[PDB]
Amino acid sequence: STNLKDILADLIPKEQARIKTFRQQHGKTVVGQITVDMMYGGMRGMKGLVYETSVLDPDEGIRFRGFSIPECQKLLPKAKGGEEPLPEGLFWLLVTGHIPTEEQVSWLSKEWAKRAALPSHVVTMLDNFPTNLHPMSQLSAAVTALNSESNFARAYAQGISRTKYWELIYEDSMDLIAKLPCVAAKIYRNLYREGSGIGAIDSNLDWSHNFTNMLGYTDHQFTELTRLYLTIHSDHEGGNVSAHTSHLVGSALSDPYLSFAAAMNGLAGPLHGLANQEVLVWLTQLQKEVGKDVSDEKLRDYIWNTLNSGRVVPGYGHAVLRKTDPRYTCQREFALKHLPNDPMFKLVAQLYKIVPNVLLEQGKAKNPWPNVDAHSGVLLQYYGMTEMNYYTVLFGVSRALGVLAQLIWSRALGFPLERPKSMSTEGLMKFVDS
Amino acid sequence: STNLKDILADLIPKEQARIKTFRQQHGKTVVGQITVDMMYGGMRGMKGLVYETSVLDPDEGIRFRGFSIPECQKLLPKAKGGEEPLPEGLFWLLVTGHIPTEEQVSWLSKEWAKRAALPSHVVTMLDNFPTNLHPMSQLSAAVTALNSESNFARAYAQGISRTKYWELIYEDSMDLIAKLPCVAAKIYRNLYREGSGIGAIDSNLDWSHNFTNMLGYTDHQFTELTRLYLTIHSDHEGGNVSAHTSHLVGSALSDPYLSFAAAMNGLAGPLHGLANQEVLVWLTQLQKEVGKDVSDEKLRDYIWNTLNSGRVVPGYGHAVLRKTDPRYTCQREFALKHLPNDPMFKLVAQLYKIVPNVLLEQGKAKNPWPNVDAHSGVLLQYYGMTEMNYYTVLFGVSRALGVLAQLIWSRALGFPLERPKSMSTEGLMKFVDS
Numbered sequence: 086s087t088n089l090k091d092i093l094a095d096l097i098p099k100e101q102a103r104i105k106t107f108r109q110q111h112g113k114t115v116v117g118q119i120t121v122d123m124m125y126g127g128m129r130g131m132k133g134l135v136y137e138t139s140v141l142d143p144d145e146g147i148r149f150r151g152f153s154i155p156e157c158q159k160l161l162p163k164a165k166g167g168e169e170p171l172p173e174g175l176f177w178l179l180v181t182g183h184i185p186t187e188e189q190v191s192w193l194s195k196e197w198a199k200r201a202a203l204p205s206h207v208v209t210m211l212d213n214f215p216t217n218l219h220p221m222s223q224l225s226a227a228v229t230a231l232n233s234e235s236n237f238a239r240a241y242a243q244g245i246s247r248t249k250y251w252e253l254i255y256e257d258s259m260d261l262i263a264k265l266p267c268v269a270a271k272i273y274r275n276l277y278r279e280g281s282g283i284g285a286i287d288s289n290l291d292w293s294h295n296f297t298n299m300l301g302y303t304d305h306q307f308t309e310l311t312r313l314y315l316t317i318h319s320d321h322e323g324g325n326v327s328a329h330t331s332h333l334v335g336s337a338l339s340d341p342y343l344s345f346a347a348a349m350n351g352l353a354g355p356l357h358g359l360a361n362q363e364v365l366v367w368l369t370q371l372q373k374e375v376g377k378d379v380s381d382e383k384l385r386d387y388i389w390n391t392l393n394s395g396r397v398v399p400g401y402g403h404a405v406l407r408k409t410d411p412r413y414t415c416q417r418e419f420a421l422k423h424l425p426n427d428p429m430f431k432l433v434a435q436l437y438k439i440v441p442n443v444l445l446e447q448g449k450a451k452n453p454w455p456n457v458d459a460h461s462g463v464l465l466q467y468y469g470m471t472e473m474n475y476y477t478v479l480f481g482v483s484r485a486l487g488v489l490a491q492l493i494w495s496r497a498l499g500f501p502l503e504r505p506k507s508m509s510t511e512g513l514m515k516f517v518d519s
Numbered sequence: 520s521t522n523l524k525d526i527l528a529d530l531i532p533k534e535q536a537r538i539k540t541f542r543q544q545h546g547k548t549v550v551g552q553i554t555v556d557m558m559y560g561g562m563r564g565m566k567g568l569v570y571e572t573s574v575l576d577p578d579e580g581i582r583f584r585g586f587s588i589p590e591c592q593k594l595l596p597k598a599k600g601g602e603e604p605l606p607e608g609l610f611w612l613l614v615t616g617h618i619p620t621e622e623q624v625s626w627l628s629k630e631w632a633k634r635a636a637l638p639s640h641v642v643t644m645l646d647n648f649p650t651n652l653h654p655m656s657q658l659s660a661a662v663t664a665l666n667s668e669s670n671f672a673r674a675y676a677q678g679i680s681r682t683k684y685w686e687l688i689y690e691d692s693m694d695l696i697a698k699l700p701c702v703a704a705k706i707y708r709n710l711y712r713e714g715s716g717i718g719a720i721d722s723n724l725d726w727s728h729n730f731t732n733m734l735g736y737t738d739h740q741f742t743e744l745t746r747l748y749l750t751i752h753s754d755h756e757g758g759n760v761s762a763h764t765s766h767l768v769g770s771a772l773s774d775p776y777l778s779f780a781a782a783m784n785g786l787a788g789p790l791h792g793l794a795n796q797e798v799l800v801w802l803t804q805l806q807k808e809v810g811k812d813v814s815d816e817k818l819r820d821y822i823w824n825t826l827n828s829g830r831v832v833p834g835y836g837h838a839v840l841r842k843t844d845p846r847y848t849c850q851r852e853f854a855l856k857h858l859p860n861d862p863m864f865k866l867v868a869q870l871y872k873i874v875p876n877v878l879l880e881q882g883k884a885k886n887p888w889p890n891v892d893a894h895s896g897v898l899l900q901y902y903g904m905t906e907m908n909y910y911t912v913l914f915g916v917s918r919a920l921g922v923l924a925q926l927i928w929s930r931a932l933g934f935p936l937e938r939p940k941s942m943s944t945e946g947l948m949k950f951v952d953s
């Protein structure tokens with residue numbers, strides 16, 4: 086009823102049988118071609134993997150189990166006295182494919198509060214970490230060290246049946262998610278608050294409220310933003326570096342902790358998790374080379390010169406998207422509500438007007454419209470979250486929801502080891518010549 | 520001259536041009552189809568990525584830049600009056616494509632000795648890890664925390680040109696390799712030697728010798744085995760999970776510490792680098808019930824029983840290879856030459872003539888021969904390396920050589936972000952209809 090585990094237990098056999106049938110019939114159906122260019126181009130356009138939780142039509146944006154961001158904003162349960170969707174309900178949707186009732190989201194909130202205790206070696210390790218070790222390295226090192234708690238690793242060693250793998254994965258995942266705000270808040274304070282304590286988990290609050298409590302924020306609006314941020318960053322298909330990494334590491338039957346740890350090292354890379362910071366630093370240098378309240382034409386020039394300099398306009402474009410990312414739109418709406426008269430936000434909203442006009446004239450874009458990262462950093466800066474390095478930790482906490490939801494299903498459906506074939510250049514050349 | 524960097528700096532242009540020419544010829548040539556089965560089957564049989572350092576012909580075995588294991592054994596520089604090839608020599612071959620001279624291997628030994636100092640924060644972190652935290656997990660956290668030392672991460676933040684990326688990756692990679700044995704040895708000592716110190720690096724010893732010295736071993740043969748072990752586990756194509764993970768994380772421009780750390784989370788998986796242990800356990804379980812001594816049908820029972828029980832003669836087959844891993848043969852030869860009157864080796868050898876009888880007879884199989892992992896554990900055990908949990912750490916240290924050789928080339932060749940396309944079952948079901 087409210088026990089996610091029994092609900093999942095009921096869904097899984099339906100889904101096994103539905104895939105078994107599908108593979109019997111259409112297993113040998115060709116869905117795409119592989120070229121030389123795709124092999125050297127990082128599997129671009131290559132249909133690589135099955136990923137159930139979410140799907141990104143390049144035209145209309147991410148869909149969580151068929152539901153768009155707007156639909157989730159409406160249907161997903163909210164906090165009492167709040168407007169933004171709770172991450173809890175997102176997670177439930179990703180795991181069950183069903184919109185949760187208020188009671189199930191409350192149940193889940195209690196489960197995650199109850200599983201939030203950190204083992205002392207992990208506390209100790211975060212507290213001894215130096216201030217020059219980046220937040221994302223700290224997050225990953227600590228999640229890896231939490232695998233001491235892994236049910237799944239201990240059970241695998243003792244020869245547990247394949248049919249039961251997903252149960253241990255689920256427990257481990259519920260444990261990880263529950264703990265992530267503690268880990269992340271402990272990093273936040275140790276770096277940016279002279280190592281002050283994270284305080285206590287309130288058993289009756291939602292995941293995002295305990296998190297902001299542990300971060301030291303009391304602004305109700307920052308808690309609403311967090312709930313909106315953690316929902317919308319939760320998943321973005323299987324092919325993004327962090328989801329693919331966790332999928333790949335998961336398939337060797339590495340436990341959730343190690344799987345997720347690997348995903349964060351993926352997310353720590355510039356071309357994945359840093360665009361947020363890359364946009365903010367530019368917006369700051371923009372308002373420091375053109376000044377505030379500038380002119381739409383003065384702006385049009387800055388954009389032109391930037392592209393003539395051969396530099397990118399950060400936050401505009403996507404690997405696969407070809408339109409305004411709904412996660413951008415999502416954030417704009419929240420800005421229009423709670424901080425419409427913010428210098429930086431007006432600038433962002435100004436750049437929405439100009440930037441999609443160039444790039445398409447430049448001819449080089451395909452996607453001239455903005456992505457999520459164009460809009461996230463000014464919301465975070467607005468509420469006093471100014472430490473840019475830390476931003477990707479927030480992304481990572483969010484992305485746990487997506488990839489762990491899917492990891493449960495990957496194990497439920499017995500997905501095997503990911504292991505493609507590679508070729509050398511010299512080997513490719515001989516192969517094409519035959 | 521003896522500077523690997525300058526040699527590499529002169530190789531790179533030639534290789535870039537050679538790939539440019541190839542893509543300009545065959546960019547759009549089809550080299551494979553993607554089926555629905557492949558997407559469910561973890562990309563099995565799909566030609567996904569380019570990987571230059573090594574190539575696995577499914578018939579003959581692994582080739583490092585063209586050379587087979589026997590060729591490497593005859594050709595590669597060995598240690599003073601030793602018999603086994605130095606890993607240093609292997610790494611030079613993978614980077615350059617060229618068999619190194621004695622002088623080049625001597626220079627490379629020294630470079631790694633000079634780069635071996637651990638930051639204190641890593642030292643502290645390792646000394647504070649508990650004994651219930653797996654050696655592989657310690658290794659992976661330690662490497663991640665080493666990314667505070669990263670040249671490449673710092674340089675990228677400052678806007679360094681693309682054309683220099685490989686140079687910093689080379690610096691980060693040399694330092695990591697240099698430091699790996701220190702980490703690995705500290706883990707060994709903290710778990711299995713009451714936290715006794717690893718001692719000093721010796722500037723006039725090879726990489727493997729400093730490693731055994733730090734492990735606390737003083738057997739000349741053990742050092743020889745290590746040299747051989749670290750050479751032959753070094754690389755095995757790009758499709759394996761540890762190589763592919765590092766390739767994938769690497770493609771976000773995550774530095775080599777993050778990339779390697781994610782690969783260790785991948786290697787830590789039971790379907791990747793835990794076989795070495797399984798064999799030694801299963802062997803002992805055989806040598807208990809059946810006794811040290813065994814007959815042929817004595818196996819037939821165990822095997823058929825186990826194959827009819829759902830288990831499998833451990834490490835007796837691969838997922839792409841379809842023959843007798845030459846790596847085993849390398850070890851068998853070593854034992855016959857050094858540990859012949861050893862009971863467990865005698866048994867492993869006694870199993871090399873019998874097991875082969877079935878497998879094909881079962882029909883439900885592909886490789887009717889052993890792999891690398893069927894034979895490593897007994898050798899290690901012979902020399903007092905009895906801590907099975909640690910065995911994968913030795914694999915980790917080895918595998919650094921392959922994935923980092925490739926990582927330099929990847930950034931040098933300007934390989935882009937790995938971003939394939941995922942589909943839901945729901946989505947795949949619609950796609951086939953049209």
Ligand SMILES: CC(C)(COP(=O)(O)OP(=O)(O)OC[C@H]1O[C@@H](n2cnc3c(N)ncnc32)[C@H](O)[C@@H]1OP(=O)(O)O)[C@@H](O)C(=O)NCCC(=O)NCCS
Pocket residue numbers: 356357360392396397398399400401402403404405444449450451452456458
């Ligand atoms: C997301 C991104 C990496 C996609 O790269 P991609 O799919 O390989 O690029 P495309 O297929 O659009 O390539 C077409 C051209 O448009 C360029 N382009 C894409 N977005 C651009 C932008 N905002 N400003 C300028 N040029 C841009 C590409 O660099 C490329 O230039 P080139 O062919 O002359 O070398 C790219 O749009 C980008 O760098 N965006 C800015 C950073 C960002 O917002 N990242 C976060 C999203 S993950």
Ligand SMILES: O=C([O-])CC(=O)C(=O)O
Pocket residue numbers: 320321324325326327357404938
């Ligand atoms: O989709 C991608 O490849 C990158 C990304 O924005 C994400 O993971 O959210």
